[PDB]
mmCIF file of C-alpha atoms in Angstrom:
data_model
loop_
_atom_site.group_PDB
_atom_site.id
_atom_site.type_symbol
_atom_site.label_atom_id
_atom_site.label_comp_id
_atom_site.label_asym_id
_atom_site.label_seq_id
_atom_site.Cartn_x
_atom_site.Cartn_y
_atom_site.Cartn_z
ATOM 1 C CA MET Q 1 17.081 11.405 12.239
ATOM 2 C CA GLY Q 2 13.696 9.994 11.226
ATOM 3 C CA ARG Q 3 15.335 7.970 8.436
ATOM 4 C CA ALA Q 4 14.966 4.624 10.172
ATOM 5 C CA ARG Q 5 11.191 4.876 10.693
ATOM 6 C CA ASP Q 6 10.920 5.623 6.957
ATOM 7 C CA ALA Q 7 13.069 2.596 6.128
ATOM 8 C CA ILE Q 8 10.866 0.343 8.292
ATOM 9 C CA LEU Q 9 7.742 1.498 6.447
ATOM 10 C CA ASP Q 10 9.396 1.149 3.018
ATOM 11 C CA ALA Q 11 10.428 -2.435 3.843
ATOM 12 C CA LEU Q 12 7.086 -3.560 5.306
ATOM 13 C CA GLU Q 13 4.828 -2.184 2.555
ATOM 14 C CA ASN Q 14 7.179 -3.969 0.060
ATOM 15 C CA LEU Q 15 5.952 -7.292 1.514
ATOM 16 C CA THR Q 16 3.109 -9.378 0.169
ATOM 17 C CA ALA Q 17 0.151 -9.903 2.480
ATOM 18 C CA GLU Q 18 1.410 -13.456 3.027
ATOM 19 C CA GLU Q 19 4.911 -12.250 3.924
ATOM 20 C CA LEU Q 20 3.517 -9.630 6.322
ATOM 21 C CA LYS Q 21 1.463 -12.360 7.996
ATOM 22 C CA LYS Q 22 4.599 -14.497 8.433
ATOM 23 C CA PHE Q 23 6.633 -11.459 9.561
ATOM 24 C CA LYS Q 24 4.086 -10.659 12.273
ATOM 25 C CA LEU Q 25 4.091 -14.283 13.458
ATOM 26 C CA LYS Q 26 7.897 -14.199 13.597
ATOM 27 C CA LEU Q 27 7.668 -11.121 15.870
ATOM 28 C CA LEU Q 28 6.166 -13.334 18.607
ATOM 29 C CA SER Q 29 9.331 -15.401 19.039
ATOM 30 C CA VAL Q 30 12.186 -13.242 17.759
ATOM 31 C CA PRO Q 31 14.825 -12.788 20.485
ATOM 32 C CA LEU Q 32 14.546 -9.451 22.277
ATOM 33 C CA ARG Q 33 17.050 -7.481 24.326
ATOM 34 C CA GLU Q 34 16.536 -7.265 28.071
ATOM 35 C CA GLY Q 35 13.617 -5.160 29.266
ATOM 36 C CA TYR Q 36 11.836 -4.706 25.907
ATOM 37 C CA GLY Q 37 8.204 -5.719 25.528
ATOM 38 C CA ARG Q 38 6.773 -8.337 23.214
ATOM 39 C CA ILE Q 39 3.812 -7.424 20.986
ATOM 40 C CA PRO Q 40 0.780 -9.608 21.838
ATOM 41 C CA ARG Q 41 -0.517 -11.985 19.191
ATOM 42 C CA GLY Q 42 -3.950 -10.364 19.162
ATOM 43 C CA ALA Q 43 -2.593 -6.865 18.633
ATOM 44 C CA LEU Q 44 -0.884 -7.927 15.407
ATOM 45 C CA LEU Q 45 -3.997 -9.401 13.763
ATOM 46 C CA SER Q 46 -5.491 -6.162 12.397
ATOM 47 C CA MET Q 47 -2.222 -4.470 11.396
ATOM 48 C CA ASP Q 48 -1.086 -3.440 7.921
ATOM 49 C CA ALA Q 49 2.466 -2.231 7.216
ATOM 50 C CA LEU Q 50 1.542 1.313 8.306
ATOM 51 C CA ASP Q 51 0.149 0.028 11.621
ATOM 52 C CA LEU Q 52 3.116 -2.293 12.192
ATOM 53 C CA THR Q 53 5.680 0.438 11.579
ATOM 54 C CA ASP Q 54 4.105 2.590 14.313
ATOM 55 C CA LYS Q 55 3.893 -0.334 16.746
ATOM 56 C CA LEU Q 56 7.518 -1.331 16.158
ATOM 57 C CA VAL Q 57 8.709 2.222 16.733
ATOM 58 C CA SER Q 58 6.597 2.480 19.913
ATOM 59 C CA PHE Q 59 7.742 -0.810 21.522
ATOM 60 C CA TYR Q 60 11.367 -0.562 20.402
ATOM 61 C CA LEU Q 61 12.718 2.695 19.158
ATOM 62 C CA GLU Q 62 13.407 3.905 15.666
ATOM 63 C CA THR Q 63 16.990 2.625 15.880
ATOM 64 C CA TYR Q 64 16.384 -0.759 17.558
ATOM 65 C CA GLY Q 65 13.099 -1.321 15.745
ATOM 66 C CA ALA Q 66 14.981 -1.195 12.449
ATOM 67 C CA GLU Q 67 17.690 -3.617 13.635
ATOM 68 C CA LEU Q 68 15.035 -6.037 14.824
ATOM 69 C CA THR Q 69 13.040 -5.750 11.570
ATOM 70 C CA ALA Q 70 16.233 -6.599 9.655
ATOM 71 C CA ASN Q 71 16.787 -9.621 11.912
ATOM 72 C CA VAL Q 72 13.307 -10.964 11.146
ATOM 73 C CA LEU Q 73 13.698 -10.415 7.398
ATOM 74 C CA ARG Q 74 16.946 -12.415 7.502
ATOM 75 C CA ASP Q 75 15.197 -15.313 9.286
ATOM 76 C CA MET Q 76 12.495 -15.246 6.548
ATOM 77 C CA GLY Q 77 15.098 -15.617 3.782
ATOM 78 C CA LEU Q 78 14.519 -12.128 2.348
ATOM 79 C CA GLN Q 79 18.197 -11.202 2.474
ATOM 80 C CA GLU Q 80 17.978 -8.527 -0.228
ATOM 81 C CA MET Q 81 15.332 -6.554 1.644
ATOM 82 C CA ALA Q 82 17.205 -6.849 4.938
ATOM 83 C CA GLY Q 83 20.252 -5.384 3.220
ATOM 84 C CA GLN Q 84 18.394 -2.336 1.909
ATOM 85 C CA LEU Q 85 16.953 -1.796 5.422
ATOM 86 C CA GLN Q 86 20.349 -1.989 7.163
ATOM 87 C CA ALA Q 87 21.886 0.157 4.430
ATOM 88 C CA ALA Q 88 19.332 2.935 4.872
ATOM 89 C CA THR Q 89 19.790 3.318 8.641
ATOM 90 C CA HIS Q 90 23.539 4.065 8.361
ATOM 91 C CA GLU P 1 10.722 -3.435 -26.942
ATOM 92 C CA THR P 2 14.037 -5.320 -27.562
ATOM 93 C CA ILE P 3 17.724 -4.391 -27.915
ATOM 94 C CA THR P 4 19.466 -5.886 -30.962
ATOM 95 C CA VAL P 5 23.112 -5.156 -30.046
ATOM 96 C CA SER P 6 24.708 -5.651 -26.655
ATOM 97 C CA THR P 7 24.392 -2.195 -25.153
ATOM 98 C CA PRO P 8 25.941 -0.294 -22.228
ATOM 99 C CA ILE P 9 23.611 -0.221 -19.243
ATOM 100 C CA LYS P 10 23.883 3.589 -19.030
ATOM 101 C CA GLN P 11 22.528 3.924 -22.587
ATOM 102 C CA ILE P 12 19.401 1.765 -22.064
ATOM 103 C CA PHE P 13 18.620 3.403 -18.686
ATOM 104 C CA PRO P 14 19.187 7.199 -18.690
ATOM 105 C CA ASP P 15 18.428 7.488 -14.966
ATOM 106 C CA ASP P 16 21.864 7.203 -13.345
ATOM 107 C CA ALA P 17 20.372 5.685 -10.183
ATOM 108 C CA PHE P 18 18.116 3.285 -12.075
ATOM 109 C CA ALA P 19 21.083 2.188 -14.211
ATOM 110 C CA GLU P 20 22.968 1.481 -10.990
ATOM 111 C CA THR P 21 19.997 -0.659 -9.918
ATOM 112 C CA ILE P 22 20.005 -2.586 -13.198
ATOM 113 C CA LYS P 23 23.773 -3.192 -12.891
ATOM 114 C CA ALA P 24 23.408 -4.598 -9.366
ATOM 115 C CA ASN P 25 20.491 -6.800 -10.454
ATOM 116 C CA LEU P 26 22.651 -8.230 -13.282
ATOM 117 C CA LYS P 27 25.741 -8.200 -11.026
ATOM 118 C CA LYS P 28 27.981 -6.478 -13.585
ATOM 119 C CA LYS P 29 31.027 -4.433 -12.550
ATOM 120 C CA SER P 30 30.131 -1.068 -14.135
ATOM 121 C CA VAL P 31 27.216 0.754 -15.715
ATOM 122 C CA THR P 32 29.418 1.079 -18.836
ATOM 123 C CA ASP P 33 29.293 -2.728 -19.285
ATOM 124 C CA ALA P 34 27.478 -4.130 -22.335
ATOM 125 C CA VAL P 35 24.258 -6.101 -21.764
ATOM 126 C CA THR P 36 22.236 -8.273 -24.148
ATOM 127 C CA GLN P 37 18.482 -8.646 -24.407
ATOM 128 C CA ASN P 38 18.872 -12.227 -23.169
ATOM 129 C CA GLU P 39 20.496 -10.928 -19.968
ATOM 130 C CA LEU P 40 17.774 -8.277 -19.527
ATOM 131 C CA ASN P 41 15.181 -11.055 -19.870
ATOM 132 C CA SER P 42 16.495 -12.804 -16.719
ATOM 133 C CA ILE P 43 15.273 -9.951 -14.451
ATOM 134 C CA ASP P 44 11.946 -10.797 -12.860
ATOM 135 C CA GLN P 45 12.159 -8.744 -9.649
ATOM 136 C CA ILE P 46 13.557 -5.284 -8.898
ATOM 137 C CA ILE P 47 13.992 -3.766 -5.437
ATOM 138 C CA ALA P 48 15.225 -0.175 -5.356
ATOM 139 C CA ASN P 49 14.434 1.564 -2.077
ATOM 140 C CA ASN P 50 15.352 5.175 -1.447
ATOM 141 C CA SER P 51 17.581 5.395 -4.523
ATOM 142 C CA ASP P 52 16.759 8.934 -5.704
ATOM 143 C CA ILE P 53 15.357 7.566 -8.988
ATOM 144 C CA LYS P 54 13.529 10.093 -11.173
ATOM 145 C CA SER P 55 12.651 7.906 -14.191
ATOM 146 C CA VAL P 56 12.385 4.190 -14.898
ATOM 147 C CA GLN P 57 12.795 4.775 -18.628
ATOM 148 C CA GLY P 58 14.317 1.648 -20.130
ATOM 149 C CA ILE P 59 12.165 -0.687 -18.012
ATOM 150 C CA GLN P 60 10.044 -1.208 -21.144
ATOM 151 C CA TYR P 61 12.753 -3.736 -22.118
ATOM 152 C CA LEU P 62 12.335 -5.997 -19.073
ATOM 153 C CA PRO P 63 9.337 -8.125 -20.158
ATOM 154 C CA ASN P 64 9.540 -10.781 -17.409
ATOM 155 C CA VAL P 65 9.407 -8.538 -14.310
ATOM 156 C CA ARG P 66 6.802 -9.813 -11.869
ATOM 157 C CA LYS P 67 7.872 -8.025 -8.627
ATOM 158 C CA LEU P 68 8.493 -4.267 -8.816
ATOM 159 C CA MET P 69 9.196 -2.382 -5.592
ATOM 160 C CA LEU P 70 10.464 1.178 -5.926
ATOM 161 C CA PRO P 71 9.484 3.002 -2.703
ATOM 162 C CA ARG P 72 10.841 6.409 -1.699
ATOM 163 C CA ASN P 73 12.062 7.576 -5.060
ATOM 164 C CA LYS P 74 11.064 10.679 -7.049
ATOM 165 C CA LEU P 75 8.880 9.059 -9.730
ATOM 166 C CA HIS P 76 6.436 11.430 -11.426
ATOM 167 C CA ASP P 77 5.432 9.121 -14.275
ATOM 168 C CA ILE P 78 4.843 5.388 -14.587
ATOM 169 C CA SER P 79 4.013 5.319 -18.310
ATOM 170 C CA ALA P 80 6.966 2.987 -18.919
ATOM 171 C CA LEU P 81 5.092 0.247 -16.986
ATOM 172 C CA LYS P 82 2.053 0.043 -19.312
ATOM 173 C CA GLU P 83 3.314 -3.103 -21.113
ATOM 174 C CA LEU P 84 4.881 -5.133 -18.264
ATOM 175 C CA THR P 85 2.121 -7.729 -18.439
ATOM 176 C CA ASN P 86 4.005 -10.115 -16.144
ATOM 177 C CA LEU P 87 3.708 -7.634 -13.254
ATOM 178 C CA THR P 88 2.024 -9.218 -10.297
ATOM 179 C CA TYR P 89 3.163 -7.060 -7.338
ATOM 180 C CA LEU P 90 3.636 -3.318 -7.814
ATOM 181 C CA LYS P 91 4.564 -1.240 -4.759
ATOM 182 C CA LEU P 92 5.155 2.460 -5.446
ATOM 183 C CA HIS P 93 4.761 3.887 -1.970
ATOM 184 C CA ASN P 94 6.418 7.193 -1.026
ATOM 185 C CA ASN P 95 6.780 8.487 -4.584
ATOM 186 C CA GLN P 96 5.412 11.742 -6.049
ATOM 187 C CA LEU P 97 2.753 10.562 -8.551
ATOM 188 C CA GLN P 98 0.037 13.191 -9.147
ATOM 189 C CA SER P 99 -1.928 11.407 -11.861
ATOM 190 C CA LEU P 100 -2.280 8.053 -13.519
ATOM 191 C CA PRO P 101 -2.301 8.265 -17.329
ATOM 192 C CA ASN P 102 -5.630 6.939 -18.553
ATOM 193 C CA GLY P 103 -5.379 3.205 -19.174
ATOM 194 C CA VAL P 104 -1.975 2.920 -17.472
ATOM 195 C CA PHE P 105 -3.207 -0.275 -15.740
ATOM 196 C CA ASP P 106 -5.368 -1.763 -18.525
ATOM 197 C CA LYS P 107 -2.664 -4.269 -19.605
ATOM 198 C CA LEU P 108 -1.531 -5.389 -16.098
ATOM 199 C CA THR P 109 -4.097 -8.169 -15.810
ATOM 200 C CA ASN P 110 -1.921 -10.341 -13.552
ATOM 201 C CA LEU P 111 -1.620 -7.805 -10.685
ATOM 202 C CA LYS P 112 -2.333 -9.188 -7.252
ATOM 203 C CA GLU P 113 -1.253 -6.254 -5.049
ATOM 204 C CA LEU P 114 -0.953 -2.530 -5.779
ATOM 205 C CA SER P 115 0.243 0.169 -3.337
ATOM 206 C CA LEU P 116 0.079 3.883 -4.176
ATOM 207 C CA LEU P 117 0.509 4.823 -0.528
ATOM 208 C CA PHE P 118 2.130 8.213 0.092
ATOM 209 C CA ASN P 119 1.839 9.706 -3.360
ATOM 210 C CA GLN P 120 0.140 12.933 -4.479
ATOM 211 C CA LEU P 121 -2.914 11.695 -6.412
ATOM 212 C CA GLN P 122 -5.619 14.344 -6.466
ATOM 213 C CA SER P 123 -8.003 12.296 -8.619
ATOM 214 C CA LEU P 124 -8.394 8.877 -10.256
ATOM 215 C CA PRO P 125 -9.246 8.267 -13.938
ATOM 216 C CA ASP P 126 -12.610 6.703 -14.721
ATOM 217 C CA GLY P 127 -12.219 2.925 -15.095
ATOM 218 C CA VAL P 128 -8.571 3.084 -13.988
ATOM 219 C CA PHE P 129 -8.777 -0.265 -12.120
ATOM 220 C CA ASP P 130 -11.360 -2.005 -14.333
ATOM 221 C CA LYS P 131 -8.896 -4.533 -15.841
ATOM 222 C CA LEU P 132 -7.129 -5.668 -12.613
ATOM 223 C CA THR P 133 -9.523 -8.572 -12.061
ATOM 224 C CA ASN P 134 -7.056 -10.517 -9.867
ATOM 225 C CA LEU P 135 -6.327 -7.619 -7.490
ATOM 226 C CA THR P 136 -6.447 -8.545 -3.809
ATOM 227 C CA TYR P 137 -4.529 -5.612 -2.168
ATOM 228 C CA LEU P 138 -5.150 -1.930 -2.951
ATOM 229 C CA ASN P 139 -3.541 0.762 -0.811
ATOM 230 C CA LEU P 140 -4.385 4.341 -1.818
ATOM 231 C CA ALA P 141 -3.866 5.863 1.631
ATOM 232 C CA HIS P 142 -2.037 9.182 2.161
ATOM 233 C CA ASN P 143 -2.859 10.803 -1.176
ATOM 234 C CA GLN P 144 -4.769 13.997 -1.962
ATOM 235 C CA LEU P 145 -7.952 12.430 -3.323
ATOM 236 C CA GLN P 146 -10.963 14.750 -3.489
ATOM 237 C CA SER P 147 -13.538 12.199 -4.711
ATOM 238 C CA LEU P 148 -13.910 8.674 -6.118
ATOM 239 C CA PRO P 149 -15.261 8.119 -9.669
ATOM 240 C CA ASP P 150 -18.459 6.086 -9.717
ATOM 241 C CA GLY P 151 -17.955 2.332 -10.049
ATOM 242 C CA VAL P 152 -14.181 2.704 -9.658
ATOM 243 C CA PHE P 153 -13.963 -0.543 -7.650
ATOM 244 C CA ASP P 154 -16.889 -2.351 -9.325
ATOM 245 C CA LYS P 155 -14.583 -4.814 -11.150
ATOM 246 C CA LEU P 156 -12.325 -5.720 -8.162
ATOM 247 C CA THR P 157 -14.275 -8.745 -6.967
ATOM 248 C CA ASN P 158 -11.286 -10.486 -5.319
ATOM 249 C CA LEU P 159 -10.218 -7.408 -3.313
ATOM 250 C CA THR P 160 -9.633 -8.227 0.369
ATOM 251 C CA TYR P 161 -7.837 -5.016 1.462
ATOM 252 C CA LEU P 162 -8.788 -1.475 0.473
ATOM 253 C CA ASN P 163 -7.179 1.526 2.200
ATOM 254 C CA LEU P 164 -8.557 4.995 1.385
ATOM 255 C CA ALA P 165 -7.310 6.608 4.651
ATOM 256 C CA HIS P 166 -5.668 10.068 4.736
ATOM 257 C CA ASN P 167 -7.279 11.627 1.727
ATOM 258 C CA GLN P 168 -9.752 14.459 1.433
ATOM 259 C CA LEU P 169 -12.856 12.507 0.467
ATOM 260 C CA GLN P 170 -16.009 14.523 1.139
ATOM 261 C CA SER P 171 -18.479 11.893 -0.105
ATOM 262 C CA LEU P 172 -18.707 8.349 -1.415
ATOM 263 C CA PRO P 173 -20.652 7.352 -4.570
ATOM 264 C CA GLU P 174 -23.835 5.364 -4.109
ATOM 265 C CA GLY P 175 -23.028 1.654 -4.004
ATOM 266 C CA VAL P 176 -19.268 2.283 -4.290
ATOM 267 C CA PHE P 177 -18.468 -0.943 -2.371
ATOM 268 C CA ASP P 178 -21.449 -3.067 -3.453
ATOM 269 C CA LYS P 179 -19.392 -5.500 -5.560
ATOM 270 C CA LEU P 180 -16.620 -6.095 -2.951
ATOM 271 C CA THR P 181 -18.187 -9.208 -1.334
ATOM 272 C CA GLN P 182 -14.765 -10.650 -0.424
ATOM 273 C CA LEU P 183 -13.402 -7.500 1.223
ATOM 274 C CA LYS P 184 -12.089 -8.158 4.742
ATOM 275 C CA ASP P 185 -10.394 -4.841 5.525
ATOM 276 C CA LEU P 186 -11.660 -1.335 4.661
ATOM 277 C CA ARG P 187 -9.892 1.822 5.886
ATOM 278 C CA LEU P 188 -11.647 5.180 5.566
ATOM 279 C CA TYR P 189 -10.032 6.981 8.508
ATOM 280 C CA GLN P 190 -8.833 10.582 8.263
ATOM 281 C CA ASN P 191 -11.057 11.890 5.488
ATOM 282 C CA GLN P 192 -13.605 14.706 5.248
ATOM 283 C CA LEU P 193 -16.726 12.537 5.168
ATOM 284 C CA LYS P 194 -19.828 14.156 6.647
ATOM 285 C CA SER P 195 -21.867 11.025 5.866
ATOM 286 C CA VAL P 196 -22.019 7.925 3.663
ATOM 287 C CA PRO P 197 -24.889 6.654 1.500
ATOM 288 C CA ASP P 198 -27.518 4.416 3.077
ATOM 289 C CA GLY P 199 -26.385 0.804 3.252
ATOM 290 C CA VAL P 200 -22.945 1.568 1.796
ATOM 291 C CA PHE P 201 -21.399 -1.345 3.747
ATOM 292 C CA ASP P 202 -24.501 -3.535 3.584
ATOM 293 C CA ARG P 203 -23.164 -5.952 0.935
ATOM 294 C CA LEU P 204 -19.668 -6.436 2.517
ATOM 295 C CA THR P 205 -20.496 -9.797 4.094
ATOM 296 C CA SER P 206 -16.784 -10.665 4.566
ATOM 297 C CA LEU P 207 -15.725 -7.430 6.323
ATOM 298 C CA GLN P 208 -13.613 -8.103 9.432
ATOM 299 C CA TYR P 209 -12.115 -4.659 10.128
ATOM 300 C CA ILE P 210 -13.255 -1.131 9.316
ATOM 301 C CA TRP P 211 -11.710 2.224 10.324
ATOM 302 C CA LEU P 212 -14.135 5.166 10.417
ATOM 303 C CA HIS P 213 -12.464 7.555 12.903
ATOM 304 C CA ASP P 214 -11.249 11.106 12.199
ATOM 305 C CA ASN P 215 -14.133 12.002 9.889
ATOM 306 C CA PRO P 216 -16.510 14.957 10.508
ATOM 307 C CA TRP P 217 -19.659 12.863 10.823
ATOM 308 C CA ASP P 218 -22.782 15.055 10.884
ATOM 309 C CA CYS P 219 -25.433 13.652 13.223
ATOM 310 C CA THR P 220 -28.249 15.320 11.251
ATOM 311 C CA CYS P 221 -26.970 14.693 7.710
ATOM 312 C CA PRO P 222 -28.971 12.093 5.725
ATOM 313 C CA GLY P 223 -27.732 8.525 6.024
ATOM 314 C CA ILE P 224 -26.105 8.935 9.452
ATOM 315 C CA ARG P 225 -28.980 6.969 11.027
ATOM 316 C CA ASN P 226 -28.217 3.954 8.831
ATOM 317 C CA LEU P 227 -24.522 4.297 9.655
ATOM 318 C CA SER P 228 -25.449 4.381 13.355
ATOM 319 C CA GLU P 229 -27.635 1.287 12.995
ATOM 320 C CA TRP P 230 -24.903 -0.437 10.964
ATOM 321 C CA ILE P 231 -22.311 0.353 13.648
ATOM 322 C CA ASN P 232 -24.619 -0.880 16.432
ATOM 323 C CA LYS P 233 -25.154 -4.187 14.563
ATOM 324 C CA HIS P 234 -21.447 -4.601 13.613
ATOM 325 C CA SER P 235 -19.739 -3.032 16.651
ATOM 326 C CA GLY P 236 -16.839 -5.520 16.704
ATOM 327 C CA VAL P 237 -15.812 -4.677 13.126
ATOM 328 C CA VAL P 238 -15.013 -1.027 14.011
ATOM 329 C CA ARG P 239 -11.383 -0.354 14.948
ATOM 330 C CA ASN P 240 -9.499 2.641 16.330
ATOM 331 C CA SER P 241 -5.968 3.760 15.418
ATOM 332 C CA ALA P 242 -4.471 1.496 18.099
ATOM 333 C CA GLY P 243 -6.073 -1.493 16.380
ATOM 334 C CA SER P 244 -8.651 -2.279 19.076
ATOM 335 C CA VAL P 245 -12.386 -2.743 18.789
ATOM 336 C CA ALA P 246 -13.812 0.774 19.270
ATOM 337 C CA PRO P 247 -17.339 1.221 17.847
ATOM 338 C CA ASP P 248 -17.391 4.673 19.501
ATOM 339 C CA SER P 249 -14.251 5.797 17.638
ATOM 340 C CA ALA P 250 -16.409 7.360 14.862
ATOM 341 C CA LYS P 251 -17.370 10.724 16.334
ATOM 342 C CA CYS P 252 -20.010 13.329 15.521
ATOM 343 C CA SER P 253 -18.197 16.577 14.780
ATOM 344 C CA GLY P 254 -18.962 19.533 16.999
ATOM 345 C CA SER P 255 -20.670 17.539 19.741
ATOM 346 C CA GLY P 256 -17.972 14.860 19.797
ATOM 347 C CA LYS P 257 -20.529 12.149 20.610
ATOM 348 C CA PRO P 258 -20.213 8.622 19.145
ATOM 349 C CA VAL P 259 -22.078 8.107 15.865
ATOM 350 C CA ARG P 260 -23.175 4.923 17.631
ATOM 351 C CA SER P 261 -25.041 6.989 20.266
ATOM 352 C CA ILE P 262 -27.474 8.506 17.709
ATOM 353 C CA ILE P 263 -29.917 5.566 17.976
ATOM 354 C CA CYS P 264 -30.472 3.340 20.921
ATOM 355 C CA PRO P 265 -30.250 -0.300 19.566
#
């Protein structure tokens, strides 16, 4: 109802600058459902957590953008954060 | 700052939600369970998102916390953090802080990154950041700031990211960025700036990205000519909300014309 965009922002601003840089790199290769776009490498370069939250909600939606963000956090080893993201959407 | 008898979690942490957080961190069954100071000492990171926390009273007892992430709670006061000298990452976005007690950050000399994004700060204390010599990340965006105290950033020599976007800044102090020679990323978008002082960005020799859009730039106001010359010389630095190079994104109010267009370069 708007809750999942908030959860994406809360998760991404929780990350260190290093972890955001690795998250954004992981976005280039993370498996996507059919028909959804991939964010170009150049577009990610200038993006803070605010900017990334908007981009993720505009490529994917609120609902799928959160599921994908949780997938990437799991592949980075940050299991605790991925749990609080998945918990907040439902 | 210590507990001398094993104590129920609920007693040390009056906030019911924060006590739940402490119990999960320590992996106990109930908040009624008894905890020792040795067990409290094992906690070095806390993550409590969207947990309806009002107070972190009792966090004074957790002297080893380095990573503190409490976004989207209802915090009005962070006094209880004054003595957590092991803090190195402090993210308090989407809370309801309206003021920082004077000297609240003077003891947090290990802080790398600080985010006060989406709070309600109407002003900053003088010298509030002077002790955070190792700070690299400072997000103050989406507050209610009316001005910046002079020299507020003068001590933050390692800062690489500074976000002042979405406030109500009407002016910037002379030389307010002159010590930030390592800054790569400066966000000033969505403020009430009519102009900036001459050469305000002149000493930022590491700047890679700047956001200047959604400010009421006055094409006649003093210092706009320097800003126009600066933009013309550093056009690739200037970004729009989509993230793209857009040196024209900074717009003269009223006419709507690019600040860049004022001079021909």
